[PDB]
């Protein structure tokens, strides 16, 4: 009864603390002796070199699961995709903890990727809830020309159509254009006054500047913005009244990995008595056969549900993504993020803090605006 766990982390202190967490999880009652083994590796700067090294070290060490987090440089993309494909060749379940990008959601590409961090697309599920409390019916969407943006748009459209409702319009823009003034100008000639933005940080800053120069930040407008489009340089150009989303302890890698190691240990314990067990391939070289128990391990991981983690309950969606995540709805006051509302799933609960709106208005505006200029 020997099961090894691979780790692809950023800093050595995290490696030591997660090794300590694995040592704690070794006994945890029930388990016997040395059923768990801990292995770790750093983030190799080159993607091809990283993909080679993860197979040369982790796969060669008989890892049942691989733990991978965000790179130590958040500004750089540095996606863990190279480590997802290789372990996906042998159906090895990789576990992401801080990769919020909505590319791994489609499991046709990443066959054995599971993440406990909700993606940006799930943020769309929050937005409809924001429409319920404030009675938003007419609304417009801005989406960057990216797979993540398209997935978020599809999720929002499906959730709105579930209530037999349609948004006013959706504007698609390429990730990097500067002359976005035409899109905002043509969006101004609409009844809806609330815009949902889904783009990159630079695109968010460009849209903020365009709105500022086109007097679109006045009273009446509502700006519902996600996590990626408020942080960083966006705060340089974000006007007051932004209703931004944030992930509670989403950037906290330590808590996410401490919950993930326990979830993986519980899944291994459940799997070691389910049915016939086939060992994972010893090495990447000289083995072109997929792991027979890989899909079963993935199903066990997706079916697992434990609230013992410090981040609250842990539940996986039908596609293997985080479900019922704690979101924080912040209202930008004096360019300062203030926690205004909480979202523990299903419903969103506000607090006693009053919500300000763009243009200095302290009263909730109305999305409907009868222009009376009927062409």
């Amino acid at each position: 009864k020997i099961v090894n766990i691979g780790a692809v982390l950023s800093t050595r202190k995290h490696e030591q603390m997660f090794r300590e967490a694995v040592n704690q999880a070794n006994k945890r009652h029930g388990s016997w002796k040395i059923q768990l083994n801990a292995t770790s590796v750093t983030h190799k700067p080159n993607a091809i070199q990283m993909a080679l090294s993860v197979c040369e070290d982790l796969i060669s060490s008989q890892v049942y699961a691989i733990l991978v987090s965000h790179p130590p440089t958040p500004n750089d993309h540095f996606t863990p995709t190279p480590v997802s494909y290789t372990a996906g060749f042998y159906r090895i379940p990789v576990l992401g903890l801080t990769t919020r990008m909505s590319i791994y959601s489609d499991k046709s590409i990443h066959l054995s990727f599971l993440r406990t961090v909700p993606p940006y697309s799930h943020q769309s599920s929050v937005w409809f809830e924001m429409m319920r409390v404030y009675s938003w019916n007419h609304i417009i969407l801005l989406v960057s020309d990216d797979h993540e943006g398209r997935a978020a748009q599809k999720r929002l459209e499906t959730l709105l159509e579930e209530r037999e409702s349609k948004a006013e319009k959706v504007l698609q823009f390429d990730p990097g254009t500067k002359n976005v003034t035409a899109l905002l100008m043509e969006a101004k000639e609409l009844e809806a006054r609330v815009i949902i933005l889904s783009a990159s940080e630079d695109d968010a800053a460009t849209v903020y500047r365009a709105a500022a120069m086109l007097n679109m930040t006045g009273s009446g407008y509502v700006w519902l913005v996600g996590e990626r489009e408020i942080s960083g340089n966006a705060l340089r150009y974000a006007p007051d009244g932004i209703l931004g989303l944030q992930l509670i302890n989403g950037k906290n890698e330590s808590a996410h990995i401490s919950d993930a190691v326990g979830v993986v240990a519980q899944a291994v314990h459940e799997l070691l008595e389910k049915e016939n067990i086939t060992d994972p391939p010893r090495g990447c070289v000289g083995n072109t056969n997929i792991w027979k128990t890989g899909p079963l391990f993935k199903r066990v991981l997706m079916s697992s549900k434990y609230a013992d983690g410090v981040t609250g309950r842990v539940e996986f969606n039908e596609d293997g993504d985080r479900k019922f995540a704690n979101y924080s709805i912040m209202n930008l006051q004096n360019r300062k993020l203030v926690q205004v509302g909480i979202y523990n799933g299903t419903h969103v609960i506000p607090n006693d803090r009053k919500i300000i709106w763009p243009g200095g208005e302290t009263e909730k505006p109305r999305g409907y605006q009868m222009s009376t200029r009927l062409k």
């Epitope: 040592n23 704690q24 002796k33 410090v310």
Partner: antibody, heavy 121, light 106 residues
Framework: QVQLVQSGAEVRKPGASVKVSCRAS????????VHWVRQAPGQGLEWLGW????????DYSQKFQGRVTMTRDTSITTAYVELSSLISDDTAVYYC??????????????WGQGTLVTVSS | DIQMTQSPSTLSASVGDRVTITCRAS??????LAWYQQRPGQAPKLLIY???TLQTGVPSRFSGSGSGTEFTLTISSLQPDDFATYYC???????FGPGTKVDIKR
């Protein structure tokens, strides 16, 4: 030298809640697991559970799951165990012990004096 | 869970008499057994770890041996401090044995 100071003996009525504190000194509190173990009079040792102050994770025995709670205070380096729904069988002597972090071969190197909890009418 | 059986349960011997304690587990536990000595009104004291190496500072009279499921503790000359209960515990299961104590013959 590892020093552990426990509270005095307590008498509680059945159905109430009891809290026992154990102050640790002379060693790195965060770098060692704190284990709670109870012993009935004239009976074998009954392992309650353990807690790691560094991470805050707690492990409880299956018998006491759902009623036992373990907390740690790093500011004063003190462990606390709270037990609810007390029964007559809970009358026992509780001990806090130290365990090395990352080592699974040195169980309970040091033992405390112990605190007696009596549940009777 | 691993069940520990100790023989004899209570040995009514005298001072200096050879004391042999045999502890058997339900299943194979390799060598993950710990021998502790406990006195009435006092906390147990560790004597042997890993079922083969005595704790540092323990008297040389104690001798621990065995493997698999069967382990043995031998005392050549029992002293006044040796009149105490002995427990064999499995670390991987945290299961303690019934306890072998030396009683005064009457």
């Amino acid at each position: 030298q590892v020093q552990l100071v426990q509270s005095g003996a307590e008498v509680r009525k059945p159905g109430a809640s009891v809290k026992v504190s154990c102050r640790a000194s002379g060693y790195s509190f965060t770098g060692y697991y704190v284990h709670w173990v109870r012993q009935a009079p004239g009976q074998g040792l009954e392992w309650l559970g353990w807690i790691n102050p560094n991470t805050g994770g707690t492990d409880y025995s299956q018998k006491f799951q759902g009623r036992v709670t373990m907390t740690r205070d790093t500011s004063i380096t003190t462990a606390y165990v709270e037990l609810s729904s007390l029964i007559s069988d809970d009358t026992a002597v509780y001990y806090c012990a130290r365990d090395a972090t990352g080592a699974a071969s040195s169980p309970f190197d040091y033992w405390g004096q112990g605190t007696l909890v009596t549940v009777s009418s | 869970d691993i069940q520990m059986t100790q023989s004899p349960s209570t040995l009514s011997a005298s001072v200096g008499d050879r004391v042999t304690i045999t502890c058997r587990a339900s299943q194979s536990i390799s060598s993950w057994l710990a021998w502790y000595q406990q006195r009435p009104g006092q906390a147990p004291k560790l004597l042997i770890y890993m079922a083969s190496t005595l704790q540092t500072g323990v008297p040389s009279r104690f001798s621990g041996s065995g493997s698999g499921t069967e382990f043995t503790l031998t005392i050549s000359s029992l002293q006044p401090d040796d009149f105490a209960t002995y427990y064999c515990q499995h670390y991987k299961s945290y299961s303690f044995g019934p306890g072998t104590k030396v009683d005064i013959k009457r």
